[PDB]
From a paper:
The A2HBD has elevated expression in F. prausnitzii A2-165 and is crucial for the transformation of acetoacetyl-CoA to 3-hydroxybutyryl-CoA in the butyrate cycle. The monomeric structure of A2HBD consists of two domains, N-terminal and C-terminal, with cofactor binding occurring at the N-terminal domain, while the C-terminal domain facilitates dimerization. The A2HBD protein exists as a hexamer in solution.
The crystal structure of apo-A2HBD was determined at 2.55 Å resolution. The apo form of A2HBD belonged to P21 space group with unit cell parameters a = 87.660 Å, b = 126.611 Å, c = 108.071 Å and α = 90 Å, β = 110.208, γ = 90 Å. The apo-A2HBD protein assembles into an asymmetrical hexameric configuration, wherein all six subunits adopt nearly identical conformations, displaying root-mean-square deviations (RMSD) for the Cα atoms within the range of 0.2 to 0.378 Å. In the asymmetric unit of crystals, it contains three dimers with three two-fold axes.
Residue numbers in the entry:
A (entry chain C), B (entry chain A), C (entry chain E), D (entry chain F), E (entry chain D), F (entry chain B): 1 to 289
Amino acid sequence: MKIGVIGAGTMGQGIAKAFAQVEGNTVALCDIKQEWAENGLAKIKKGYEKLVAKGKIPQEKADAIVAAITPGLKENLCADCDLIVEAAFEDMKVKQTTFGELDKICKPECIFASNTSSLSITEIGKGLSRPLVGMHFFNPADRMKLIEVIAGCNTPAETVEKIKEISVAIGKNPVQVNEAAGFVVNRILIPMINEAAFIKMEGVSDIAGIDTAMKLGANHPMGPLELGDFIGLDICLAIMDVLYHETGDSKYRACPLIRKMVRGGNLGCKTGKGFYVYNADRTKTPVDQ
Amino acid sequence: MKIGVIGAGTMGQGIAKAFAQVEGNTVALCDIKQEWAENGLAKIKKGYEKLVAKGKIPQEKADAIVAAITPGLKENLCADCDLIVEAAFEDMKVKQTTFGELDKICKPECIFASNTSSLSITEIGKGLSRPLVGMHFFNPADRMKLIEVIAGCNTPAETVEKIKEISVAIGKNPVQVNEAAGFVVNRILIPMINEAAFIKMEGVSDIAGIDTAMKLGANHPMGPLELGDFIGLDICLAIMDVLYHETGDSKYRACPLIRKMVRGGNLGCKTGKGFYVYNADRTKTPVDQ
Amino acid sequence: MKIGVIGAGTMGQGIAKAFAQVEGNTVALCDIKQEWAENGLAKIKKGYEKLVAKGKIPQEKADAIVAAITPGLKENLCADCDLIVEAAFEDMKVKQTTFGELDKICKPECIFASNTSSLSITEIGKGLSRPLVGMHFFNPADRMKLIEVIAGCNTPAETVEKIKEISVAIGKNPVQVNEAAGFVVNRILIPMINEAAFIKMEGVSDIAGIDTAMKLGANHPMGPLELGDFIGLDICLAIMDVLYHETGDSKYRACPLIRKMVRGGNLGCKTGKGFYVYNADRTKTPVDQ
Amino acid sequence: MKIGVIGAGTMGQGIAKAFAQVEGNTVALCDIKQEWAENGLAKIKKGYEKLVAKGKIPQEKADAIVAAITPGLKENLCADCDLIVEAAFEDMKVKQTTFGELDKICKPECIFASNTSSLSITEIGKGLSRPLVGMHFFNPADRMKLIEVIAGCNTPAETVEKIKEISVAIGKNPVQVNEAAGFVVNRILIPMINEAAFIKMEGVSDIAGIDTAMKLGANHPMGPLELGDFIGLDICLAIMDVLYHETGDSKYRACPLIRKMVRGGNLGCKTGKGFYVYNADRTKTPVDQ
Amino acid sequence: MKIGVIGAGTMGQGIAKAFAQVEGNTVALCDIKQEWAENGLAKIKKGYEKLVAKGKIPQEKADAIVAAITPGLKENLCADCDLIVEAAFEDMKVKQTTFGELDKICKPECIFASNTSSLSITEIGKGLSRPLVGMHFFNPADRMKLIEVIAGCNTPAETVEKIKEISVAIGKNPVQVNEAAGFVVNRILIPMINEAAFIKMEGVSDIAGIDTAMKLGANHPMGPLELGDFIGLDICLAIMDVLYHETGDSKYRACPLIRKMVRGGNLGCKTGKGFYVYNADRTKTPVDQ
Amino acid sequence: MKIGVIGAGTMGQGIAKAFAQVEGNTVALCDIKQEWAENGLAKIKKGYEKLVAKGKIPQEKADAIVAAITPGLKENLCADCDLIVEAAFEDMKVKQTTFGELDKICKPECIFASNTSSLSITEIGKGLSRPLVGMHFFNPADRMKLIEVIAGCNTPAETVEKIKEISVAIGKNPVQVNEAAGFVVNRILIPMINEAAFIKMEGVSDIAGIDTAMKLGANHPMGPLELGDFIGLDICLAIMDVLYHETGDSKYRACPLIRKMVRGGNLGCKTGKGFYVYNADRTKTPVDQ
């Protein structure tokens, strides 16, 4: 099958990889600009020469993967595609027009899916001719094997089974989700990080104490403060506000301490500082000390 | 050093083991009737009998462990204990009373600690003539490496470090906590579970779906529902209620579904049913199907 | 079938007539003392003698209905009973002890049912040898057709339908409720009254205009304030506190104005005064003027 | 008197009917352009061309009613008007522009009233030369007999009574409301529907079981979910969010299921599906089976 | 007039003084037993000679005041009093019975007033056969000019005016409150101190800087933390928990930092430590340092 | 030192005089127009010329303060300044750009401060080359002695000291605040006013009774309703909404009464009506009567 992947950003690249990894699957990596298409494609090229050179990929397998992936922009490429997985800018009117255009571009049998974490799958596919489903990947999508199959108000049960079967065609475990804010993982995980920021804000414990408590007591792989610096605190803060706005419940109000840090650019690793300082010399120190 | 452990239930066994796995650590495992204490030791001798039969521990240390835990009842035992770790029934006047009795019994230098998870360390030692501090273990205490050190309103810093030093001396990391509901672990962990039951209850995903989504989407060792069954859905409901009463915050309201199930005696593993049925075949079925 | 109705107050009387109006049904009207049983049996006959007047039921049938209901208490009367509908004091460990006594008394096939509106079905049938179900009648039980069948956490499916069958056997429409505070009608009806009381207390409109507006703008049979006086303002207040405590949600916080009135004994109709003064001369005046 | 109604939709139509059914009442229907106004007058004509032919009204009147209604648009007809009843588009600043235009068009002693449900009466007529009062009709305006008179912060008691006076002059009962979100009826009626959605979403019972529980246990003329579809789920959703935003109280938080259904265009009767499917053969099947 | 004051603790002695200060007023200080009723009166004498000793009262007037106050227990002295002011334990069943005993003892025209700030005036006079009204004083009662006349549900307006007249007659300014939790002063003043504890608990600023910011910013006499130490943090916590329970609104949830200090006996000025440690050498240090 | 004040409005002049009152302090008062700037200085002269002829301050000192305030626009004037106090429109991008321009103009050592009460100090300096700090004055700035020093997420401790030191050197008392909504004064003070309006609205007391119960009961200089009119109710409504929005906590929901009143132009003293009508003949009357 042929798969069109809208958006050549970090999530788009990882989704292109997840399909190119298998077999006869072809990936049309479209974006706004062919420059931005091949940009993401050169990024896919770079990594996939590395795990060659570290005895982790043969080469005639690393090459056949970038070979199934053809970049470019849509319109050109998505007419024959079997499935669209859009991974563009988490913006309602973007996704709506993008899907309106592809609605006349793609063949009638193409399945429409979006990777959105924070927008209504149902609202995205309102005035359309074909069902719109949610196919939620987890970065890096080419390694992580969970798929949340988001069902919308009008998404037929068959459109769901098809995605679950495709997911099981590329190596993932699909979990069915009837549309609600934060689905399952975000709705549970992000408020974990929020609670940790409230615990630090109220002088209950320190940054490093909270994280070693959470990983030696719940045997988690990371502390929640660590984890949020790794997700990006602007991601965390945005998820909290979606939950809060979708529910009307103060239970999901964001820690003011997260909204302060994000206002200051202290977003975590990607900005060198959030709850920890990632030193130009590689290691990790809590801003407590 | 000598350690008196009040309560021969599951926690006092685990705590008595964590001490007795080391060196000059003698233990006095006490309960309300000596019979019940001699019971607790019998279950200790029991596993330690298997661990030797699995080559996993020499007998020569496993016997020197049990030989250092002496069963009996306080008055007759904790008189020269250097430290008291109370782990009895989660009731206020029970703990104000046994600590009040222990204030006359034990020598002026013995430290008073409580393993409570749901009561105020500050209120448990209101009448005492010495400080009272929290020493929060996690079952199984002998295997779990975390101890939350809880300073009450009047716990001196010198006592708090004497708990940090004792915890390093038995292989554990002390996190210091200023007394607040849930400390760190439970305040983050049990609202995870509570959100998982809300998700099931609001028809978002299924029990098996939620659990595999949290261990794949976030790499948690267990699913939240699976985890509730294993801590005890009565513990979870209680911890949630303590949070809601201590703070007055609707955020920590407990999912009516967990109360529905605790009222039904469906508390998880220890009652054969919970979010999963623990079928006699030693497998595990989600009660969705 | 033979039915045992526990409690001889307004509801137990009404439930007995609901069953004795039928056919091969006979009722055991029990309470604490036999004087208290046949007391409610006395009211039932006199009510039927009033019906024999009017032209509404012949004295042949009025006698036939009453010859089915036997006064007395359990222990003597409820051993071959097939169904037990309880309607006693809205208090948990009474219903638990009352059902605990009937556990030995009633025969093993006898379904245990409760009419409770505010207690957890699940909790009452906790210790019991046999399941517990909700059979929620609506005053007056002999005329109102609605029955909410409440499933508890452990109510088997077959029990729920043995109760939907019987409800049709006496001319009711069963609606299945999966236990949750206030089930369906109260959880909607009672917060209607409560919001009406806030409208008065926050000065939005007067008492007659709030009631006029709702039966004119919504074609409702009564206005919420009138309805609150008719139900009993102490019933409405207890129900709101149940909704609020079961959910921990301030959405169901009771209007202080209703609590003020219940504290002053102004409970509605049964005390001659609530939101309206019920003049002993038949008429109804709002305490606004 | 002569009344200027602005807006020729469902409300404008019914509002002018209620005025033109009386006596010396002449009405100036207006809208954006007269193609829009003559439009509404024509729908008024058709319904009146059926209420005669069924035998229920004679033509003489059903001719003189439409005779007193003159279609068109403002500026040329609502100068000598006495009472303005705006019913245009539920958006603030156009209402502010609309009223400020008539501020100079109309004669000074002309009363300004608005029919708004979700907008501040006080805010609409801020900078105006003259008071602005609420005159909340209920669809259909020609027969529903309730009218809510909305007092704003600066709405003199005199303007309010001259609105009650006019209201008893056309058969309706006026209820004075002092401004607050949802007045009396929506604030009580729409959270009803909101709670019924929660009862469905939370698995408490099914769609048809909810609606028949509230029409048998409470003698309501329709079920809450029925009524939801009848009102328009988009309208219900909008009111629930005016209450929340105006109060800041999570008590009026919209049920996320209502919102999901609205995002998919499933609004109820006017789209053929909300909680029921409105079969094109005049039946009604709940979307539950 | 003759005044019966029920209770000889801090408040009773304060109300007795505030009456006997006038002239033709005699007070009947009654409490549990006479040496407790005789305890206050000596306490009262102590101050008043100091009041002469520092020529702030002649002895002429400091002895005529102690002369007007006759101790002993009720029943003996209250058969003829014009006004009764209960100042006993803030316990509902005590209040109800002492007033109930008083209902036969006092004469038909004796007014019943209570000084309670935390209990329902409506409920306290529920059974009684004459109006119950609130007369709320502020410690110390003899110098503080404000009285809050609490009208209960069934408290007649005539009873409010005579309470208002008496107040003006003893040199107070009365403010009419229709019963609601915290009346007016506590409802405003105590959430201030609660907010100040949150600021400190959340790291916003230190204990001294908050208190100097509120007196230098709002020109307040004392800082909210200072003031809480003065009132007694056990008192401030009790008002919050009453506000929270009466209203059901988490808006009145008590700072957990206040419950921690109270559980530890750090109540403020009356224990030597609160937000400030009070040095026996007359100064005051924030626990921040 | 030299100080550039940005904004010639009521807050900018106070800040100009507070610095120029001292000595070697010189001041640059800048605005959008220079006819806007020396408008603010000319009023400074007018004010100082009124206190000259009250015999309260001598001319030669009035002259000496005015002679150190040079008006005009930035760009020209603030190039050599050593402190920047921004007091312009409370408008997020206005400041972000105004501060962006200044960052080029001023020397590398000029400290940057904003007198903003409701905006984030961290966001205002999101991408500047230098740190940005809070310097919160109180109208009237030249007379009020409190300054809250506001540290944003990235504000260096030393920068916070330079503001503490400068504050002490111009006579003020600096309270350090780690940026949170409402700082200390407002976050405490404005919810008082807010709660006062909820008492009025819920019919608990009346406007003048509340305002006297606070200044007699708590020995406050003004009542909360009075203070509200004095600050401006639009400001109060605006601070209440920042808190609600910054926390997601309904604790800080604005009273609907105040929203109705601001939506009504009734803002207090500055519109001649709010909770009191500020009559033209100097006196003040509660709108209650």
